[PDB]
Scaffold this active site. Structure first.
Site: not given
Ligand SMILES: C[C@]12CCc3c(ccc4cc(O)ccc34)[C@@H]1CCC2=O
Ligand SMILES: C[C@]12CCc3c(ccc4cc(O)ccc34)[C@@H]1CCC2=O
Lengths: 127, 126
Positions: A15, A39, A99, A102
């Site tokens: 990913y 997100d 930074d 996930d």
């Protein structure tokens, strides 16, 4: 099948490589058809491949974005994992770095069911 | 609810306490009804005595060390995620383990949930 811990590490690393090359359609294919994306985490979830495609097109479609792991993928035994990485893009017309961490849960087909991306402006640097 | 900057401070303070091994101080960081999923994928731990027992078993030898391997990533809703590494000796084999902790704090600044992402793939012998 539901990805083992090693398979989770492989998928989450792939990913990031797709983010880095900017392959929106391949990213979208990594997600389950009804996946949820948060997100940055804290914002309303978005649901489904159409909305997810639009989100990644807006995020990656304009001006070069690079992404790379900054440490190993941490993987669980129930199809989940978490990874630290950095994205480099343009901010204020200048290079900047963000930074991120996930967190992903995969389904029994090996597709991303949920992603939470942890970051805020405290994680954005320049110079 | 802790601000993103406050989240960074608290999660870094947690790592500091883990590294010195102060069980009582770590437990005091948790909220009354806190839950700990560590490793994520295991049944949750509820209860102050249960969380204390869990950290006693993990750190009770005084030799475990822990350090951030990158910055805390903090949200605006009192949550954060951090990467770190833990060093310890496992039956004579000196080892290190890469971990990511995801935490949600409450309006009193105490840990409501901790989820620790790691498994054997993250284990190494030094
Ligand atoms: C979209 C973004 C680039 C890519 C990216 C950002 C933030 C979180 C991300 C999380 C991902 O899993 C993949 C890419 C991003 C950036 C924030 C601002 C920006 O330019
Ligand atoms: C318990 C442990 C030491 C410390 C530690 C481990 C795993 C996850 C952790 C998560 C934390 O937030 C703090 C400490 C640990 C280790 C796994 C094996 C081991 O010895």
């Amino acid at each position: 099948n539901l990805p083992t811990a090693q398979e989770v590490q492989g998928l989450m690393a792939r990913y990031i490589e797709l983010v880095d090359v900017g392959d929106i359609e391949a990213i979208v294919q990594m997600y389950a058809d009804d996946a949820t994306v948060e997100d940055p985490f804290g914002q309303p979830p978005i649901h489904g491949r159409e909305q997810i495609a639009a989100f990644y097109r807006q995020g990656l479609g304009g001006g070069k974005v690079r992404a790379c792991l900054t440490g190993p993928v941490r993987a669980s035994h129930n199809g989940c994992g978490a990874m630290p990485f950095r994205v480099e893009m343009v901010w204020n017309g200048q290079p900047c770095a963000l930074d991120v961490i996930d967190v992903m849960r995969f389904d029994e087909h090996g597709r991303i069911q949920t992603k939470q991306a942890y970051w805020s402006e405290v994680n954005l640097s320049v110079r």
